Amino acid sequence: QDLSEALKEATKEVHIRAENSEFMRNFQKGQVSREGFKLVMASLYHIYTALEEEIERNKQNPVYAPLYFPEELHRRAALEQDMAFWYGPHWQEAIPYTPATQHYVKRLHEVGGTHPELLVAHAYTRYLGDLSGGQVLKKIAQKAMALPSSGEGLAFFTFPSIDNPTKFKQLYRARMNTLEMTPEVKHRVTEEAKTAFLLNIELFEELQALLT
Numbered sequence: 388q389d390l391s392e393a394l395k396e397a398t399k400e401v402h403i404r405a406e407n408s409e410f411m412r413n414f415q416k417g418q419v420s421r422e423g424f425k426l427v428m429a430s431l432y433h434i435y436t437a438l439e440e441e442i443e444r445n446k447q448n449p450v451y452a453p454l455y456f457p458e459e460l461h462r463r464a465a466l467e468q469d470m471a472f473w474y475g476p477h478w479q480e481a482i483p484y485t486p487a488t489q490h491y492v493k494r495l496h497e498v499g500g501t502h503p504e505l506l507v508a509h510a511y512t513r514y515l516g517d518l519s520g521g522q523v524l525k526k527i528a529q530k531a532m533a534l535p536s537s538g539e540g541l542a543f544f545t546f547p548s549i550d551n552p553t554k555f556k557q558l559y560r561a562r563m564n565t566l567e568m569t570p571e572v573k574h575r576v577t578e579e580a581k582t583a584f585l586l587n588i589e590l591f592e593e594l595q596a597l598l599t
């Protein structure tokens with residue numbers, strides 16, 4: 388069984404739970420406000436910063452290298468633009484760093500520094516989602532908060548280097564299938580993907596509570 392199919396199969400159940408989280412459920416209803424949106428994007432800023440730091444650390448490592456797509460996928464730069472938009476010129480010392488966000492970042496550094504063969508699970512979970520449901524969320528956000536079609540405030544959801552998200556995802560899945568695979572690595576990569584999804588769910592549950 389190809390890794391791409393193993394991952395989709397392994398995370399299909401938890402994905403349902405994730406997309407139905409209270410925060411996401413509200414977001415999908417169009418019920419999303421500046422306060423809540425700023426909290427989640429600031430949290431993603433920290434998460435992608437950690438993820439991409441570990442990707443750079445392991446860019447030449449065979450267990451990840453085939454999936455090294457900084458130009459097409461990396462979100463750090465985009466998130467910095469969004470942080471300046473939502474939090475202003477000095478967003479650096481204004482943005483929050485919640486406990487659940489810190490927990491996610493902690494696991495990312497553990498994986499990147501100690502278990503790099505599992506990094507693919509984290510890139511898969513975040514990037515492929517951004518190119519899927521994230522695109523629907525972008526449209527909901529624009530309508531709900533009156534964000535311009537020009538993109539300001541939603542740079543994170545925009546991929547100027549990817550003409551067709553659907554085609555790119557197919558390319559990415561194919562590339563994941565070229566990674567050196569053994570039963571041990573395949574088993575743990577799918578388990579780590581489940582963990583990645585749980586870290587996201589816990590983040591959303593935390594943000595929803597903070598807003599409430």
Ligand code: HEM
Nearest residue numbers: 394395405406411511512513515516519520523556584587
């Ligand atoms: C806001 C609720 C969400 C919606 C509407 C949604 C919807 C979708 C849709 C329609 C697909 C299928 C795309 C395809 O076949 O190419 C998809 C795939 C995916 N989503 Fe979500 N999603 C949501 C939340 C999430 C969350 C919270 C995560 C985890 C950070 C996530 C990660 C993924 C991943 C990793 C895939 C790719 C699965 C695969 O092809 O193997 N999604 N999502």
